[PDB]
Amino acid sequence: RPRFSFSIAAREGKARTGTIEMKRGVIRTPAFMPVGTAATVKALKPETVRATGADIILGNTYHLMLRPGAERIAKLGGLHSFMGWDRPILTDSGGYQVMSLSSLTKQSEEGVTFKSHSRHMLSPERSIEIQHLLGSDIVMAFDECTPYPATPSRAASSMERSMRWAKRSRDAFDSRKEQAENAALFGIQQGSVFENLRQQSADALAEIGFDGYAVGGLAVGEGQDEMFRVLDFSVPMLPDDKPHYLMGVGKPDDIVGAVERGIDMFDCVLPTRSGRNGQAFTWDGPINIRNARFSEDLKPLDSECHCAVCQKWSRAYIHHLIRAGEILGAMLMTEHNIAFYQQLMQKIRDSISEGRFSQFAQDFRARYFA
Amino acid sequence: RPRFSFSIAAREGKARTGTIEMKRGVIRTPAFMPVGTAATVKALKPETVRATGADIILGNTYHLMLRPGAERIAKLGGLHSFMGWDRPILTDSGGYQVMSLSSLTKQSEEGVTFKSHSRHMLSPERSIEIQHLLGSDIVMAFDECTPYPATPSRAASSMERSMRWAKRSRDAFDSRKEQAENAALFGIQQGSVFENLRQQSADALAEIGFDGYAVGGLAVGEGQDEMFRVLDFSVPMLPDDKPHYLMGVGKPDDIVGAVERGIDMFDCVLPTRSGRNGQAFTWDGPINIRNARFSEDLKPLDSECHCAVCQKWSRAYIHHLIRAGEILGAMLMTEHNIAFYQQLMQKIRDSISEGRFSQFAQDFRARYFA
Numbered sequence: 001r002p003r004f005s006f007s008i009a010a011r012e013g014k015a016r017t018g019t020i021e022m023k024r025g026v027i028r029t030p031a032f033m034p035v036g037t038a039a040t041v042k043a044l045k046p047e048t049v050r051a052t053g054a055d056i057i058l059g060n061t062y063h064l065m066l067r068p069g070a071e072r073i074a075k076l077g078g079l080h081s082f083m084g085w086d087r088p089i090l091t092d093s094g095g096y097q098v099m100s101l102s103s104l105t106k107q108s109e110e111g112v113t114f115k116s117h118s119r120h121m122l123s124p125e126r127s128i129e130i131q132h133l134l135g136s137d138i139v140m141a142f143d144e145c146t147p148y149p150a151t152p153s154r155a156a157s158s159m160e161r162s163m164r165w166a167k168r169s170r171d172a173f174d175s176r177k178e179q180a181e182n183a184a185l186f187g188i189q190q191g192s193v194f195e196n197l198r199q200q201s202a203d204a205l206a207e208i209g210f211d212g213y214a215v216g217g218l219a220v221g222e223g224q225d226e227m228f229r230v231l232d233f234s235v236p237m238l239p240d241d242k243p244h245y246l247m248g249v250g251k252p253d254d255i256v257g258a259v260e261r262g263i264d265m266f267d268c269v270l271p272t273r274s275g276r277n278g279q280a281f282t283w284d285g286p287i288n289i290r291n292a293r294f295s296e297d298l299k300p301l302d303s304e305c306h307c308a309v310c311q312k313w314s315r316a317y318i319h320h321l322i323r324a325g326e327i328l329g330a331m332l333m334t335e336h337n338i339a340f341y342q343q344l345m346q347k348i349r350d351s352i353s354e355g356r357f358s359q360f361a362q363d364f365r366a367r368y369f370a
Numbered sequence: 371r372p373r374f375s376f377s378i379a380a381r382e383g384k385a386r387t388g389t390i391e392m393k394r395g396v397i398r399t400p401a402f403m404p405v406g407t408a409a410t411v412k413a414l415k416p417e418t419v420r421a422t423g424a425d426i427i428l429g430n431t432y433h434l435m436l437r438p439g440a441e442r443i444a445k446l447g448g449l450h451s452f453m454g455w456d457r458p459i460l461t462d463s464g465g466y467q468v469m470s471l472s473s474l475t476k477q478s479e480e481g482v483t484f485k486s487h488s489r490h491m492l493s494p495e496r497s498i499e500i501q502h503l504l505g506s507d508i509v510m511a512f513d514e515c516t517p518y519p520a521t522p523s524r525a526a527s528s529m530e531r532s533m534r535w536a537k538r539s540r541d542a543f544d545s546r547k548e549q550a551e552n553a554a555l556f557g558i559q560q561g562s563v564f565e566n567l568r569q570q571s572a573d574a575l576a577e578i579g580f581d582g583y584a585v586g587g588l589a590v591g592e593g594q595d596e597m598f599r600v601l602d603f604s605v606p607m608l609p610d611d612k613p614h615y616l617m618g619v620g621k622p623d624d625i626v627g628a629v630e631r632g633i634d635m636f637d638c639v640l641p642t643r644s645g646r647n648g649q650a651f652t653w654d655g656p657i658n659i660r661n662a663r664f665s666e667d668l669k670p671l672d673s674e675c676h677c678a679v680c681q682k683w684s685r686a687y688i689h690h691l692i693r694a695g696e697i698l699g700a701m702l703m704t705e706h707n708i709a710f711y712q713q714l715m716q717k718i719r720d721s722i723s724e725g726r727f728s729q730f731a732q733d734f735r736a737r738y739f740a
């Protein structure tokens with residue numbers, strides 16, 4: 001396999017389905033990436049993550065640089081060997097998590113200094129270096145996720161800094177031969193909810209040139225209607241022949257609508273985190289397994305789901321486990337939710353391939369929201 | 371397979387190896403039973419428990435009657451179907467856990483009333499009924515685990531009550547046709563550390579007649595030297611042709627010494643509980659994976675262990691997981707510890723079969739305590 005090759009096999013409107021080939025494996029698109037922040041997808045062995053259908057997982061520069069440390073992971077042979085996942089890994093660059101999680105931050109043109117949630121530093125150069133030490137397959141540019149809401153002036157100033165940082169990220173990545181030859185680099189579009197700024201950002205990223213393009217600065221409290229409005233004009237600004245990655249999204253309906261708008265890749269902690277909290281995804285909408293109505297329900301979590309959890313255990317048993325705070329409850333809920341998300345992605349890919357995605361989207365929504 | 375058949379295939383001194391055949395499966399002896407108190411062996415799928423080599427697991431009358439409830443489990447098809455373990459299950463009778471865990475208790479000749487850790491009741495009749503509702507394969511008599519230390523007079527009075535309760539347990543079990551035809555009933559010897567009381571208890575249980583005999587009232591703070599001293603005279607008092615079950619034991623060295631003294635079956639929360647707390651068993655003694663010395667150690671938990679955890683992940687990774695409070699850390703530590711215990715039991719069985727168990731015991735101790 002090549003370092004990186006994205007091929008589009010079928011289209012319907014703005015939606016695309018195809019594959020990304022990389023040295024460590026093939027990624028089917030549209031793709032959902034389970035999140036493995038601290039070098040583990042919470043409550044799942046990597047073999048289980050793979051069994052659900054995942055082609056690629058996400059790790060985080062911010063969390064891993066703090067614990068166990070990037071240099072340490074490199075000394076131990078890299079993130080893949082460390083956690084036992086041999087397929088592609090995309091790492092976020094730290095630009096979002098530092099501002100989300102750190103107690104104290106100092107921002108400047110150089111980067112961000114911060115206190116661990118110990119004093120630490122991130123910059124385009126250090127972020128790309130950390131992602132190299134981790135051995136990430138898809139490296140994200142170091143950016144600034146503009147808070148929402150933002151005034152046009154603040155959004156512009158923020159976006160402009162991110163574009164300068166995108167160039168620095170590109171140069172740092174290219175300066176490291178082993179990284180440039182074996183990994184891919186994605187740029188991140190900013191500009192808040194403003195069409196002109198989104199266009200300027202897209203133009204700047206395309207001029208620099210990346211292997212893929214993320215839509216950053218969304219899923220930050222704006223709500224679905226607004227997110228979709230921004231995607232409507234923002235995605236067509238990106239190069240058509242490269243993957244489009246919507247960061248931090250989202251609920252099943254968010255994913256369907258984003259694919260309708262040209263998005264190829266997604267990550268979100270929702271299925272894992274909410275699974276541990278008792279929320280199970282089903283084709284008839286989410287349920288909370290803690291609810292007393294499930295205490296004697298012998299049906300599986302979802303009536304059609306093909307996952308190992310739905311083949312073997314009842315709602316009643318999983319209800320008991322989650323109520324009792326049992327680890328197996330977190331394990332079973334998480335495996336089902338991740339499997340559900342992968343089944344959603346498979347149905348999306350298949351329907352686009354067959355030219356019936358618009359109908360799938362309509363049927364999906366009618367049933368999910370009934 | 372029959373309801374119950376215990377066959378001894380080989381002996382060495384007081385040690386025996388053989389099999390218990392039951393309707394739901396064969397149990398190789400000496401046997402270790404992983405503990406699954408709340409209808410789950412904590413942090414393991416039942417398929418994983420089986421993969422480690424376990425032939426039988428333990429459940430608890432006390433915990434299950436409180437949550438999710440015995441009648442509820444019966445309505446849902448029984449404990450086996452509920453948790454997804456189709457092999458034999460032994461259930462403790464509640465006699466020990468009620469006094470260990472309940473906030474308030476009222477003891478009488480009838481049984482024990484107690485407050486949930488809601489007011490509840492246990493008696494020989496209700497305990498046997500609960501174990502029936504659960505669908506237990508090996509049912510334990512309802513007894514009283516005498517506190518340690520005990521005066522001879524208090525130990526005698528306690529033991530005498532337990533023997534009356536053993537007869538009531540026998541009669542309750544026999545009165546229920548489906549239970550009597552499909553399950554087995556074990557009696558529990560009491561008498562504290564006193565040879566004469568242990569003899570009286572053994573005589574009383576043998577007169578009633580049971581499918582197996584447990585040594586109760588130990589692992590209650592007496593320490594290994596004293597436990598071994600009591601086993602020295604207590605085990606030979608039990609019928610030779612039935613299994614001997616030491617309740618709540620124990621560390622690897624406790625198990626080896628107890629087998630040398632004629633014990634065939636064991637249960638203990640140590641490998642699961644201490645696994646979650648970071649203690650890993652190895653042939654060179656226990657280690658605490660939290661220790662900083664393991665942060666960059668690429669070796670598996672144990673150098674010889676054949677488990678899936680030792681095949682794939684390093685000490686360094688598991689150290690990181692346990693330090694971070696990650697669920698996968700609990701999962702991996704638990705699977706390894708249970709697998710280690712099963713490998714210990716296999717080495718014990720094999721060495722007895724080959725007439726080299728005494729040598730195995732010596733070699734085991736020299737290395738484990740080096």
Ligand SMILES: N#Cc1ccc(CCNc2nc3cc4nc(N)[nH]c(=O)c4cc3[nH]2)cc1
Pocket residue numbers: 092093094095096097140143144145146188215216217218219220247248249250268269270273274
């Ligand atoms: N449970 C749950 C749950 C918790 C949080 C979220 C929102 C995630 N939103 C989000 N992640 C992002 C990551 C990002 N990373 C970078 N480097 N840049 C972004 O603009 C960016 C934007 C994001 N927006 C969604 C679901």
Ligand SMILES: N#Cc1ccc(CCNc2nc3cc4nc(N)[nH]c(=O)c4cc3[nH]2)cc1
Pocket residue numbers: 462463464465466467510513514515516558585586587588589590617618619620638639640643644
């Ligand atoms: N980690 C850990 C850990 C926690 C506790 C223990 C001690 C367990 N000892 C023990 N369990 C028992 C259960 C028992 N059940 C019944 N029905 N009767 C007993 O005499 C009896 C005696 C026991 N002794 C051992 C390890």
Ligand SMILES: [Zn+2]
Pocket residue numbers: 301302305306307308309310311336337339340
């Ligand atoms: Zn499922």
Ligand SMILES: [Zn+2]
Pocket residue numbers: 671672675676677678679680681706707709710
């Ligand atoms: Zn192991």
